[PDB]
């Protein structure tokens, strides 16, 4: 019945070093209903043009 | 300070994590294994088709389209990315739908690429369809002694706005 | 389960049949008197079906009779001259038929039969479109029937015979018809965006009592009257949702962002307000307190003519009927369910085959990081060049182009070959000449 | 952490990596001794205890487990 | 007796996946990966006559069997654009004995997605044909005076004046005998008709024409009585012969472990609490869970 | 059963193919039948209908070559023309990325025709910019002076001409004849004439009709139309007063509150747009717009669990997208729910109907991977984001960061140059290029890059220290 002991002290930065930054995660914006309808009406014309 | 504040959602989530941490760990490791699998799969498929515009043998190419109207300016920004080594024999070949776009010179040699300079190599694409039809255009950069493209790029040509 | 319409007795109702509004009715056509309603559905394919559902099961379908001509807008009201017992009205395109669903019992759950008798009929000169029923004027204990026509005319039957019939002034496409009892008025929505109310005795004497120019044409109009405090008239357009007063002006309106198909202002809760529920074409139900959404649910099908009724000791069950043939009684789902990955100790990740595939792919990756013959022949004579290409493997999407120089001009530039079987030769011929 | 994630073999190999890659921190040795003694071995737990005592001193709670895994071994 | 088109089973045996006598395979597709269970393992999909089967194709033990009388919605999703070919995906929603599952089937190799079409087709054929393998009361069977036959059905014996020992005064009615099902209408208000399929019959004996149901339509004992018993025993023996010759090869009239827990459509929910009334909304609502409230579940 | 009845019932049930299919018959059978005529007209015009309120492309020509705002340099805070770019991704010099793309989004405006042309076609609108923003009936054959007498025909005919054929001039002719037939007493014809004007270019001549229609009968439609007109004249504070007037008329309308919130977000004071989106929620609670916006704002102001709740709500309401599931993945990972994280990204990759959506999902998977460690998986994910969308600048920047982590400086320099060439409005590629240059030397390139960084994110900190050090080296 022994519990493993954890260090109570973390790692602390002692100087700020210029590191190359990464771009940030990108939440894909949702669409409206008018926009979806417009895109689908734009692609349906293409489909009928190709299907003739 | 601006130290944030956590609502009931946070304590309920931490309680779930404290009571069901093992299942979360296991399922996240399984998901990570499957993600490594699928990423390696897609990387190998891209290497097969040579669809990466960034791929010893150092290069980097990306194609920009400019302009509305039936005539678009398509400029390929190509760049040799190496310490000091030029690339002598390379050539660019375009793949398009010959019924929608009229490329004057769909194949041309590229100048000696000096390491560090972005070469803009531009062409004039022209939409031929009287109806608005947007079709992709592929670009392949390849050696002159080889037949497998060194790298490739894609461009979705916008609508024509013709007359 | 949250925001889903959890399922109750549900069924599919035929072989690619087709329904519309007015089809789904829900009342005591059996005249038991106990309160439990019974579903009635009639398609314009012909079959009239009546159900007494219990929470799939065989004995649920009371009867599935078939009439020859199509069926429009089954209704349940006191459509007989003598008694105060509910009778079932079936409106075929050129026919009216009052029936009576009499159920006799046997000494077993499935020994009980149900007989419909054609109490009376009515030949319809014009082609019927839809109808309404109510105690026209101030009569009580009677349910007269005002049927419309596809060409505007509205004909009124006083529960026995052809009372009269008057043409609607200025209508082309017949819209939804209803009858308000607190004002004794037939309210319709003409083709020209006008919600119009006519007093009954005015039409009986043949005009417009009042009009309101809503922005569109309405799909349905449902005058609800279980509240005697402040009367209102609901009008569901194809783009908006109005609740009008009794004088003729908008009490309030909602600008819906979806496409409604059906609505039903059912029993209310607060003082003065009226709960209502509307069905998208996006497979959802919305439950407003007259403007304000109080709940929403994700239905299975596109609801046509929803109803709310007490079915087998459960009050307020929502009965929906699609136009393809589905039907479903349902209750709202109010169970917020933890979002958490399922614990399936049985299902393990097969490390052997997956590691084989990953070793293969990683081998390809770490390895890469370290078919056709063309020939040209020029003639010895504007010289004609001929290019022959021959493949080893079968190839596809072949494009052959020629580039000489600026001054020299070719009579042919591009040549397109489609798929070619292996060991097949292709020759092209063009001519080059100086121009400049 | 691993020890608490129902994966003791991975904890074994991780502790081996650590003890090979650690030089002047006895906490690793004491924790590996605790893992071993809880695994019912009590044999290599003495090896990790002796490795720790060869490495050595201030933490209040690493002192007690030092003496409790000693006396109980 | 017959469960292939009535249940949804997981980790099925190598024998229960085999085509039942009346069953018949239609279409197959290899490399169909299974999802909604993130095992990332391939398989093989089969659209049979009565159910859809999927077996792992590498560890064929782990598998899925979904009956057609237990599916609600089947949706095909064409996505995953130009990067590769247009690959499809199959979403099946199932509800067996009040438990909702959902399975997803991803066609890995984009070179053969046609399967996902035929399934839809046969599913319609499964639902447009339920008078072949199910029991129904008081349906719309009779024409002006005759029976409306199914596609693969012809009458055998045409008997008039056959009583029904389940009612009191609406009995005397015709008795139609066919190769798929046996029906009786009432010849007087001819909507009291019963259409029993041979599939649901368990044993036809006499105690009088007693017909028992096969534990699916309940213990529905049907009793009929005819003229002097000569034709009666004749009908009983011919009915038994037809029953056996049908059960030899069924028809079905279709023209042309913790595994469950990882396939729930709701998410960690296999349940439906008792639907009780709701004074707040005025609708029949599912019972609330020990402290929750409607206006507290609605807000965010 | 009957032709006209079955066709009209198909129309009621929103079939819109069968309806026309029976009317075409019914019209071939009888050359004199106007019921089926206008019914087929309705069906045709409603297969393509889209309400004019939320169609505000404007385009490149309107953006520069059309000046309508009275004030040229109005006070900051009264014209349309939060988290810093160090947290929230951006699209222009400012204008952080929004939730709920709508086809009326302008999201900044270009300065010159050249800049608008030489930029990506979809960097100022939800759709690529445009310079300008047999047949059933031939418009040149019918005498609108005779259909105007019959309003039952005139209304459907105008809807056909306007929304199907898009003939604003003939539509306006018909609407003028109709309005003069009604003696200017029906608000609908006034609203339609105002719409004809508004898409002809005449805003004041449209505001006149919309005001005169509001005087007839208050409707949410006319309020939103005036809101569009006022926003076109660059007058936010007039549109807000008009919206509060409308809410005084309709006490709890959701579209009006949502328009107020949209105007407050265009003016970029989120502290009131959140309040108005919360009012929308108190009214609707299924509103995709308000839920998405409050969810994004909750995610980026380091509260990803509340955003995960707000997006699980949209998941509960049957919404099934690629955007929604990638959002759920980001939230689950950053809210520390590692069980439902990667399956959401898998559903996203499954649902993506594009090559840019797939690239964004692979970009976010690379973010997940680099948060897990194992920089090789993130390397592969960024390269796949590039392979899917060649003009993906964030993938270039992150892949160059990982390359310089490995050691390959020239690869990182070239990739950062490509990123800063594709998206100049971003600050990370410029800052990283300046940093690596200064690390090796080349203080001229470091200055030319750090100054563009300061031009992109002008309140940065490390950019200021870099510029100070550089200007100190120059003396």
Numbering used by the authors:
A (entry chain H): 7 to 58
B (entry chain D): 425 to 479, 483 to 590
C (entry chain I): 2 to 56, 63 to 213, 234 to 397, 410 to 420, 439 to 493
D (entry chain E): 347 to 402, 408 to 424
E (entry chain G): 6 to 212, 219 to 267, 296 to 339
F (entry chain F): 1 to 81, 90 to 141, 158 to 499
Which text from the study accompanies this structure?
Following on our previous strategy, we purified the BBSome to near-homogeneity from retinal extract and analyzed its structure by single-particle cryo-EM. The advent of higher throughput direct detector cameras and faster automated data-collection procedures combined with improvements in data processing with new tools implemented in RELION-3 led to a BBSome map at an overall resolution of 3.4 Å from an initial dataset of 770,345 particles. The BBSome is composed of 29 distinct domains characteristic of sorting complexes. α-solenoids, β-propellers, pleckstrin homology (PH) and appendage domains are all present in multiple copies and our previous map made it possible to build a Cα backbone model that encompassed 25 out of 29 domains. For building the current model, the previous Cα model was docked into the map, and the higher-resolution map enabled us to confidently assign side chains for most regions. The new map allowed us to build the coiled-coil domains of BBS1 and BBS9, for which densities were not well-defined in the previous map. Altogether, 27 out of 29 domains distributed across the 8 BBSome subunits could be modeled. Despite the increased resolution of the current density map, the gamma-adaptin ear (GAE) domains of BBS2 and BBS7 could not be modeled, and side chains could not be assigned for BBS2βprop, BBS2cc, BBS7βprop and BBS7cc. Consistent with our previous observations based on a 4.9 Å resolution map of the BBSome, the new BBSome structure cannot accommodate binding to ARL6GTP. Fitting a homology model of the bovine BBS1βprop–ARL6GTP complex in either BBSome structure caused a steric clash between ARL6GTP and a region encompassing BBS2βprop and BBS7cc. These data support a model in which the BBSome exists in an autoinhibited form in solution and undergoes a conformational opening upon recruitment to membranes by ARL6GTP, similar to other sorting complexes such as COPI, AP-1 and AP-2.
Patched 1, GPR161, SMO and other ciliary membrane proteins are all ferried out of cilia in a regulated manner by an evolutionarily conserved complex of eight Bardet-Biedl Syndrome (BBS) proteins, the BBSome. Our recent cryo-electron microscopy (cryo-EM) structure of the BBSome revealed that the BBSome exists mostly in an auto-inhibited, closed conformation in solution and undergoes a conformational change as it is recruited to membranes by ARL6GTP. Given that ARL6GTP triggers polymerization of a membrane-apposed BBSome/ARL6 coat and enables BBSome-mediated TZ crossing, the ARL6GTP-bound BBSome conformation represents the active form of the complex. Here we determine high-resolution structures of the BBSome alone and bound to ARL6GTP, and we map the BBSome–SMO interaction to model how the membrane-associated BBSome–ARL6GTP complex recognizes its cargoes.
